């Protein structure tokens, strides 16, 4: 006959929530006081004869790292000086000495080191953060924008925002999978799949309407959406030819430190020379080619419509224009010059504007003040992809259009994380056998059970301790993995199969569970498929095995009672 038989280490998995952890490569935020050194090389492994599926949209990694970025940001900002006292009347005039409403000059009373010593003090501001004190007289009167809403903070000058190419690593007993196919829509089946231990260095970058740096799609232009039919759902398009772009602030600036309190110093802005609003440069000649290619790709999905782009539909500043950071300076460039039915063969330049008070995310409690940076500044970068949103009304003219959008920071990281995916491991397999009792991690999954059984020891040994505001996470991870492993070991022990991997036992196989051709089961089948039906009778099997062990032990003792 056949007999229930256990195997430990079978290569099967199941998706589930988890908590990855950071991995980095001398004062930056993330690397300092966080993140372990990255693995120099990916221990990538190819798994043929393995088909799978992915759902990039409904994913946990993106969301998981969302609040992680938020928390690291806030914590880094925690120790810096609060600018509370500055919410004082602002007697202001027009800037310059040789009306340029882009910036206003101001002066105001304020507090010295000594409580009862008050001094006047001036500073220049961009018109954005300033507001009229009220709809009242004294037009010179103004107040900072946030004050009637909430306070803000002057970031610690030393810290910087240069996005480090962070890596993510999973905890033991879990595996990270990549769909090799370079034309995956982002939601669907995949056939060429590999597995790695840590995610490739991804920079925590932030932008609207643009995907600065990142990566191209070497194959072609890529389009993906949860459902392009549903106009509301966002669309993301990735380029396969990165487009250079530059921006700069053509001004010579420097900061005046003001001891607002005893040990707390604000950094007012000031200028040396004349004032010229920041701007950008881009080779629209380059732009047109990718535009036309993506237009053809869109037509492919819409064989009876035209294609065009207009400026942002209108709304909050950051959404309307393209916002981003440049070496820790916030820029907002009006993008009407790009999304148009016509460009030139010449370089294109854009007028941008600069804000000093920033609502990094909609909740205002985290309102930040950007300290001025000395001297002019310039950032060069490139575009790899962009976010688009469809109009949503079927014009009789069929002039289908899309507009820039964004604002959902999760989508930015999604744009890359779509590749990855996370699963756990359940190395306890059960199968019938005639017996009766008395590295390339997970690679063998590419074969059948009887054949694949040889290398179970690799999976067994690897899955334990390969790893070696923040601590809590990794501590939870390690403890939980250890608990799981101990549970499995103990279950093996109770079944009397400790110190074994192909332990035979004394419970005959039951027909009801299944009646497949054993030859196929051992040579034509794979565990990922074998487990599916067996799942049903798992608990019955466990009870039978436990009873077998109990009766064996008790009978042994009885016969050896004397």
């Amino acid at each position, epitope marked *: 006959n056949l007999w229930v038989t256990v195997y430990y280490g079978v290569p099967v998995w199941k998706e589930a929530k988890t908590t990855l952890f950071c991995a980095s490569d001398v004062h930056n935020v993330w690397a300092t006081h966080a993140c372990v050194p990255t693995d120099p090389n990916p221990q990538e492994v190819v798994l043929e004869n393995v088909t799978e599926n992915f759902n990039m949209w409904k994913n946990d990694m993106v969301d998981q790292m969302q609040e992680d970025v938020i928390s690291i940001w806030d914590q880094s900002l925690k120790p810096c000086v609060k600018l509370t006292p500055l919410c004082v009347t602002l007697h202001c005039t027009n800037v310059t000495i040789s009306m340029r409403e882009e910036m206003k000059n101001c002066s105001f009373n304020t507090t010295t080191v000594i409580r009862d010593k008050i001094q006047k003090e001036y500073a220049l501001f961009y018109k954005l953060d300033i507001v009229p004190i009220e709809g009242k007289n004294t037009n010179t009167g103004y107040r900072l924008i946030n004050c009637n809403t909430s306070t803000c903070t002057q970031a610690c000058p030393k810290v910087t925002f240069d996005p480090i190419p962070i890596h993510y690593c999973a905890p033991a007993g879990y595996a990270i999978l990549k769909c090799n196919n370079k034309t995956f829509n982002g939601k669907g089946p995949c056939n060429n799949v590999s597995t790695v231990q840590c995610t490739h260095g991804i920079k925590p970058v932030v932008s609207t309407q643009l995907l600065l740096n990142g990566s191209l799609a070497e194959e072609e232009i890529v389009i993906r959406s949860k*459902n392009l039919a549903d106009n509301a759902k966002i669309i993301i398009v990735q380029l396969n030819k990165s487009v250079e772009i530059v921006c700069t602030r053509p001004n010579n600036n420097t900061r005046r430190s003001i001891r607002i309190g005893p040990g707390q110093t604000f950094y007012a802005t000031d200028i040396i020379g004349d004032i010229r609003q920041a701007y950008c440069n881009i080779s629209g000649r380059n732009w047109s080619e990718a535009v036309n290619q993506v237009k053809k790709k869109l037509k492919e999905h819409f064989p009876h419509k035209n294609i065009s782009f207009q400026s942002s539909s209108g709304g909050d500043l950051e959404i309307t224009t393209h916002s981003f950071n440049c070496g820790g300076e916030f820029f907002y460039c009006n993008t009407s010059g790009l999304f148009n039915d016509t460009i030139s063969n010449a370089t294109i330049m854009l007028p941008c504007r600069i804000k000093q008070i920033i609502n990094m995310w*909609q909740e205002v409690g985290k309102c930040i003040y950007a300290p001025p940076i000395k001297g002019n500044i310039t950032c060069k970068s490139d575009i790899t992809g962009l976010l688009l949103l469809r109009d949503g009304g079927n014009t009789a003219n069929n002039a289908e259009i899309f507009r820039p959008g964004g604002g959902d920071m999760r989508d930015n990281w999604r744009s890359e994380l779509y590749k990855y995916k996370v699963v756990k491991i359940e190395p306890l397999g059960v199968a019938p056998t005639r017996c009766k009792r008395r590295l390339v991690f997970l690679g063998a999954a590419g074969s059948t059970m009887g054949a694949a059984s040889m290398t179970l020891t690799v999976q067994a040994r690897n899955l334990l301790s390969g790893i070696v505001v923040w601590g809590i996470k990794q501590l939870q991870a390690r403890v939980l993995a250890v608990e799981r492993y101990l549970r499995d070991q103990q279950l093996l022990g109770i079944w009397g199969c400790s110190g074994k991997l192909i332990c035979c036992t004394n419970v005959p196989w039951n027909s009801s569970w299944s009646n497949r051709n054993l030859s196929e089961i051992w040579d034509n089948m794979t565990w990922l498929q074998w487990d599916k039906e067996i799942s049903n009778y798992t608990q019955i099997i466990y009870g039978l095995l436990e009873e077998s062990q109990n009766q064996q032990e008790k009978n042994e003792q009885d016969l050896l009672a004397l």
Partner: antibody
Amino acid sequence: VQLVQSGPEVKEPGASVRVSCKATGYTFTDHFIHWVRQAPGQGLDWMGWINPFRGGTNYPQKFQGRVTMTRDTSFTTAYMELNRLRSDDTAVYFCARGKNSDYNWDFQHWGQGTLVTVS
Amino acid sequence: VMSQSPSSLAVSLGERITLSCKSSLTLIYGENYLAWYQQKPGQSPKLLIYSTSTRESGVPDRFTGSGSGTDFTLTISSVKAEDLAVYYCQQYEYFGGGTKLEIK
């Protein structure tokens, strides 16, 4: 969760009319808010949505350049504004919200509905 | 355009009736769905069917929805007095021609 509007409106041709939509009972910044205009004896037609999260919007080409949508987080209230009035405008308007974020295409909750007319 | 025909019918109470919503999208891609909304004259419309045949909570089951792909149907086993009202189908921004039911 309740949806409220302001009183009906009457205005001369060629002007612009504003209407309000007050919401309550849940996170005002988690669900697209849709607008639908119904003239007497006509089918419900879509005018556009606004996402409270960051003031993003959208409109069909029929109304583009004629509509304006805005939000106030303080009072969790949406504002619509239609310019260059003309008889067609005269009709009822309903602001509605969707049961689930994922589908974001149903309408469980509806304001009482508000009528506007020209002249 | 999504079509709801006929515009009405000389119904009588207590009869099983079924009206057809025929779509026109038939393009790109889960799978497309439908929404049967109720509305009596002078009040806010109401949700009756969502998805394709999952009727809304609290609705008498005689109200029903069915169909696939392009052909869908609102259905009633036995029309009651209060049930005489107007109804529409909605897959996306667009809406059907609707239908209202009454007597001679």
